Amino acid sequence: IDAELWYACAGPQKALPPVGSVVAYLPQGHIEQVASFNNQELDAQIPRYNLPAVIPCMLNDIQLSADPDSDEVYATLTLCPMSEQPKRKSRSFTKTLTVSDTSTHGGFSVPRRAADDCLPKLDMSLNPPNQELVAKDLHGNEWRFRHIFRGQPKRHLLTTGWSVFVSQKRLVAGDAVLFLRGENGQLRVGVRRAPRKVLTSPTMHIGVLAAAAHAATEKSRFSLIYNPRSCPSEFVIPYSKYLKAVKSNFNVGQRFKMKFESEDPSDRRHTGTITGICDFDPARWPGSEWRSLQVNWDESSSSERQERVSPWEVEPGN
């Protein structure tokens, strides 16, 4: 599976740690992930696993995948607890889908800025200028597309293969579609759906903790699943970062920034102020750095509301 397509499909400004490197595994966040998939009806009556709130581990492997039907991405990781002790970027673009794009009656309207950035630079006055587009999704499938240039005024459009793309992939409005350009000119297509069993909530909610506890008293390797669309904050982060944050002193009234949204012309700076500092869930996880920062956003607009944050998630601001 392609690195670049899997990352863009997952999340913007979302990256994983390097394999072979030491990383902080944070049980509290894995738990949050598991409570995301199926709304956790109760977390009560779980045996007391005196487990550190951060577990430093060797990262032994990353295995990225994708469901063949719904194209939902996830990765399989192999952590090993430890005894006490840039790159490249390819032209891409993303767009969230309007009901016109989804409507069967219509095709799809491409952004002006996006044709320029990544799509194949096209011919003069073909009356109406067009070129065949070959795309691969995350399974190597080819979806062919007619990218014609028309309307009055002129816009960039997709017609042939757009409609079949939307039924086969079961897309709707609010959703988003993706493209990458490689050196080869081979453009790739991806799908990031808008937000909407085998085991119970308590059985997962304890199998997580049981596994880690065993793999930590044993210093034996164990596995876990990263499902980035279903994950609020990353829970496997470079062991370096963690230590830099713990050591760093935030004090109240300090202002901060956060780098969630990137990859658009306007970075859209996110910002807020530090109201307080507390062990977030003192009951099971005392003394942790997990979501230990109380923050108040600068006039938030019914989006991205999460009042509590962790010290490696924020940059001291202005």
Added chain:
Amino acid sequence: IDAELWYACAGPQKALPPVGSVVAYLPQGHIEQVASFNNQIPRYNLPAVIPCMLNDIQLSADPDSDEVYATLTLCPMSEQSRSFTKTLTVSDTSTHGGFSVPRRAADDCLPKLDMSLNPPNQELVAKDLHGNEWRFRHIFRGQPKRHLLTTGWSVFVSQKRLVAGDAVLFLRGENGQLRVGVRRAPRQQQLQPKVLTSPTMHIGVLAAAAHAATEKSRFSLIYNPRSCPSEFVIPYSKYLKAVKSNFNVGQRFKMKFESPSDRRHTGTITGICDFDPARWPGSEWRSLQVNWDESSSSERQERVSPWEVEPGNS
């Protein structure tokens, strides 16, 4: 909450224990369920049968895929009508045609229709498992006389995401209220892991059972009957009647596989052995080796449990 549809949708010849009754919780078989979705040093000394109270059953279904499942609540004990199915033909699933109904199904369960009127037809509104209404036009035409579903068949086929090889189901019952169901054919690509890795389920299962048994506190679990080989929560009566029983080798037996005719295959007992002695010593789980006389579709379910089999006469 409408049992009759869920069991027919679940599996032929499948019924659950009564709520409030004592049942054998058999972790080895629960392990197998979770191991069924995805092909797999945990150390949990757990009895191979844990006798339990059944405290509640909640039947459910994914509204998207119509996959059925049940959530059960066990508590350990210290103390010592008118139905029919068809697997969907490519004519049914194709957009060109509607659905060609078996003639015997029309007579058996469907509302008898007036043949006085030259194109005998009738509006049929059916309920699936989520309360949704599906309308259907059930016409009687062709040459020779056939029962067909025409208008609305296409929308049912796309919305419920049906293909050939799948099956459809319909029920009458006493209330005359018609219910519709879908038992999709098994695919192997659809079962894939997405919330937790297999060792973490494989030990969350044992962790849960292990704690709730030393404590005698309630615990919950999930039955996914379509993806389940043999049940792992069965009447404590059945377990104890088989355990006490002496099966000996060379004995003949019968067993209730799937299929309307409820046909059962037969065979002889090859041997009797602790199936997995290392992880589960002395257990009766699949402890019988049997060799089918009808090694037909070579299902090779050669190791089975003593309460799954009836000594085979008549």
Added chain:
DNA sequence: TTGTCGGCGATTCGCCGACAA
């Protein structure tokens, strides 16, 4: 720049007998 809508095709869909399996 880029959504939505009416308008009019070429193309499906979808109801109908035939026909044997």
Added chain:
DNA sequence: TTGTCGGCGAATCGCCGACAA
């Protein structure tokens, strides 16, 4: 009995400007 197919109507699908935001 019931699966498929040729066939012909008829209701979409899908492409094209207009028009404003």
